[PDB]
Symmetry: D2
Subunit: 257 residues, 4 copies
């Protein structure tokens, strides 16, 4: 198979990267960072996100692998000392797929894919937007911002915002609030909201039309925005599985001890 | 079809009940509260829960309908003045089904079905239980109790405990904490947790083996409990639909205005 | 001075207790568990609470000391190996005082003192009470219960309920909610509330008049309750200080590492 | 007395402003917006904040009054139709004072006064700062930002962040977190923290030294920041009281109905 390896850039990661390339050169494996079939990220969840976004155009043709040089990640969940064992097995394994989040920004119109989440915040001013679920006006939100999370991205930002952690087999999306004002005047649901496939959540500007929008790592101020559409993507990310590392055990190791 | 009608018991509900029976007697509809095919609840979500639990043994043979005499419910979501229109249409409609929660209590062994949630609390003492997800020890919980919620039951108790609201089409279950102690000694996940079908969450007593266990309305102290097993049921509840009343619009009307 | 020592009852605590008594017998110190001037608790915060409540009638005549045999406490914050050093110094030290919470239950009328908190919960049914602050009706609460916490008791139950941690020098009280229902029908403030001295918070039964009331460790069901009054006590608990152990450092050690 | 009146700028506010000036010209009252003894704000809490910050250099020489043209405020708590009655009484009343928050930013060094709160956020990057309470390292915070609130400012931003509402007679300050990351690696207290007078909370940059700092309305990016110091101010704001409008009744009207 064709393959490639990205690295956090620190000493430990590049050296582990060169060792895997060296071991890969002992097999029928061509290194190609243009049309790989296997993408190996070495570093952290952050390095893995970048790896994903570098190859989001060939998602269904790639199987991803995450090696953590530092602390255990949710995407980078293979230990360095398992790299050699990883190489042999890749020389031939099952695939596990996770849901993705599609974000649409209209003015033209730009579409994005998120692996963790997309968020919306205000550009140096009060953030007020109308939330419309499947064309039905649901609430007028006033606060810092909102966050729409993929299932696997719920252990990240979503978690800090009070969202629930959801198993990646569930094809869904989760909206959480960031510091919502709630008085007699303004009213929001408060609770996080989990949407199934085909549900479309649309954020519409009330007065200001300039938002700071984020999709995973990349955060860009968008001007003259007319709408932000959130819905579970039809595309999925594919991981290569070599053993059992249950999502709930990954949660336990990361958060409980 | 065979049918029956339960009532909150107040004046408005019994009179609306007799009027529907009267209108039903104008059609080919036999009243049978033993083997009905249609069960109509008149009152609130509470009256509907009772109606459900009265016929939990014939769930797949029944289609439920909820009329709210008081404030709009999540199960009792038909207005009184729509009763006459409801009668005609029932004389012949589509069905919508919601996931249920199976709870197993072992000592023998007793199984239950919940429409909203099942909770576990301590019997006049400190509540400590081990949480095991799919046979993997996940955490040791110390607090007031835990709550496992169906999708449709998330707008209820689950909501107050900080859980997220999830759409009933998603076949899942949600575990939330009740006042968990978190220090250097004790550690719980904090976030609510959403499990898919086939996931089994098991609560195991640490020292005390007496818990106050609840399934919807009914709450009973169980002694010598060895285990409590939570998993999405294979059975579902079937509603009769006569028009569009989206779950998210039902949420909006109940919580936003 | 006259003194006494209580013990958790385990092996380590009684032996540390006898060693201190032995060392105390080397000085001018009479052991008297009737009218002590110094009360030394050996065990945990729990053992200290009991020690407090055993001598709540002579609070202003006693100086308390807490030795933790187990993990560091907020009241039991002296290490065992500091006991010998503690004995010498007690043979002669500054005093630090903490606010207390007075609870009044009317039917006659019973008054209590709390070192951590007092809580109110329902007796096997729905909990609904009116909250009246200084004779002004503030809200109708519907949920599991409420909790009124002393400043030093905020790191305990109050903390789990989402309350804020407040420095014991501040003479105040904190009310937090337990799973409050909030919809279009019912409305509570949600936020915890901090009251100054002389503010009186009164809980009044709406329908049911039977509550499970708790003051620290002791929890008793009260019947025919007409009112529960909360206000910062005029009495304070006095600790004996031998060195600097700042409240915020005590918080750090307990919760951060 | 010398006096002045600020206005939200809309039609209703300027006309109410001119009417009060007209009525004031019937008494011994000189209009002076340089050295007033009475400052009357007409609009909302926002218009009142501006009024405060315009005269923060003569706080102890001024008595403030807030008239709400729109919805009831916490500072603008006089109804328009009470303006005429207000004028007569001002022609001669008791004063109520609220604590303030002093913020110090070091690089030189700049000091500020806040009526609601001061917050710290990151400049287009990860926010990480060390929290030091009275020179003792308390925690390393990683998240969106932190918020330090005055007592009267707790019903504002502090409230949305989960803080508790505290009575303005209590001389204190409240720190709340904004989306703190909490895993095995990073650990924060989570709970809001209430500090008494003379406690100094200091935020120190870990890697990045550029923060977006806010004091009430004004928000400015500060570069090369070395420290941010929070402590209850020695200065207080003085209101003119003409009748009883209890803080807890002001809370009820704003949030409960
Ligand atoms: N910036 N920031 N904080 C994000 C932190 O979340 C971690 N993280 C990332 Br990226 N994705 C995550 C995920 N899906 N679940 C949990 N943690 C994640 C990662 O360790 C990073 O340090
Ligand atoms: N490293 N990295 N990647 C950035 C990731 O940090 C996560 N994140 C961000 Br941004 N802010 C966060 C916060 N305040 N707390 C936790 N995670 C956060 C989120 O998952 C984002 O995708
Ligand atoms: N006891 N209690 N409180 C439960 C309150 O929740 C409401 N309720 C019930 Br029952 N089921 C519910 C549901 N699934 N979603 C929202 N509210 C519900 C009902 O109005 C009742 O008064
Ligand atoms: N009426 N009724 N039925 C009882 C329902 O009240 C709900 N409930 C209970 Br019990 N306690 C609750 C609380 N503290 N807050 C909201 N809902 C609650 C839960 O959904 C239960 O099934
Ligand atoms: N039951 N229970 N849980 C209470 C736990 O809180 C601890 N605790 C007590 Br008692 N008082 C406390 C206090 N004021 N602050 C923090 N923890 C406390 C104690 O360790 C006990 O195990
Ligand atoms: N051990 N002991 N003493 C009992 C103390 O446990 C504390 N506590 C109780 Br009761 N329930 C608690 C909970 N769910 N979480 C934390 N602390 C609790 C509270 O401070 C009480 O005074
Ligand atoms: N931007 N923003 N939101 C702040 C909202 O808080 C309100 N507000 C202000 Br300003 N100060 C407040 C305070 N101390 N308490 C409650 N609300 C306040 C005001 O109505 C404003 O619309
Ligand atoms: N209008 N006005 N003044 C700005 C006030 O809005 C308040 N505020 C801000 Br900024 N963000 C807020 C939020 N997300 N929610 C509530 N209040 C907020 C805060 O009290 C600030 O002083």
């Amino acid at each position: 198979m064709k393959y490639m390896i990205t690295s956090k850039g620190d000493e430990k990661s590049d050296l582990l990267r060169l060792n895997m390339i060296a071991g890969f050169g002992e097999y029928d494996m061509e290194y190609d960072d243009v049309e790989p079939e296997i993408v190996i990220s070495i570093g952290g969840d952050g390095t893995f996100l970048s790896a994903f976004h570098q190859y989001e155009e060939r998602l269904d043709e790639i199987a991803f692998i995450g090696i953590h040089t530092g602390h255990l990640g949710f995407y980078a969940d293979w230990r360095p000392a398992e790299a050699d064992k990883l190489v042999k097995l890749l020389a031939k394994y099952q695939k596990v797929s996770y849901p993705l989040l599609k974000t649409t920004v209209k003015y033209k119109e730009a579409t994005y894919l998120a692996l963790n989440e997309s968020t919306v915040k205000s550009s140096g001013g009060p953030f007020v937007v109308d939330v419309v679920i499947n064309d039905i006006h649901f609430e007028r939100f006033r606060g810092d911002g909102l966050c729409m999370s993929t299932p696997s991205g719920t252990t990240a930002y979503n978690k800090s915002l009070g969202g629930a952690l959801m198993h990646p087999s569930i094809e869904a999306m989760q909206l959480t609030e960031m510091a919502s004002i709630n008085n007699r005047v303004y009213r929001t649901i408060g609770s996080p909201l989990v949407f199934p496939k085909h549900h479309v959540v649309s954020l519409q500007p009330v007065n200001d039309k300039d938002f700071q929008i984020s999709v995973d790592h990349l955060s860009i101020l968008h001007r003259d925005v007319q709408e932000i559409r959130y819905e579970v993507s039809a595309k999925k990310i594919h991981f290569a599985r070599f053993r059992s590392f249950p999502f709930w055990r990954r949660v336990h190791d990361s958060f409980i001890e």
